[PDB]
Amino acid sequence: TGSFFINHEHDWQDVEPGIQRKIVAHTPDLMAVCVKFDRGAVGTPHQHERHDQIGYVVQGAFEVELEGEKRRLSPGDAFVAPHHTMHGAVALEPDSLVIDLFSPRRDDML
């Protein structure tokens, strides 16, 4: 049907120490999640068997690893990890923000 997401209207949910998120929007094929990292918070390297993922950097910076290759990403930069692609991140500045986008939707995050 269609929805709006008003950021101010939604709390941060705890993912783990130094990491918070908010589910932004989704359909069965497409999901956006806003993720907030303290400086030095770590997204452990991992792979998705069934989901594609793009991380778009909105604030702060991240060192992102894609299958061993590292790149420093600052606001406006992005990575894409097709499914079966190892990726991980380390946040380099306070309140680093990345938009994780997925296809299909990540039902495990509800």
Nearest-approach distance from CB 110 to a copy of itself, in angstroms:
15
Nearest-approach distance from CB 29 to a copy of itself, in angstroms:
4
Nearest-approach distance from CB 20 to a copy of itself, in angstroms:
14
Task: Measure the CA–CA gap between 4 and 71, rounded to whole angstroms.
Answer: 33
Task: Measure the CA–CA gap between 75 and 6, rounded to whole angstroms.
Answer: 21
- Report 6-65 residues binding Ni ion (CB under 5 A): 53
Question: In the complex with a copy of itself, which residue's Cβ is closer, 1 or 44?
Answer: 1
Q: Judge whether 24 and 36 are in contact, CB under 8 Å.
A: no
Task: Measure the CA–CA gap between 100 and 34, rounded to whole angstroms.
Answer: 6
In the complex, which residues of this chain contact Ni ion (CB under 5 A)?
Answer: 53
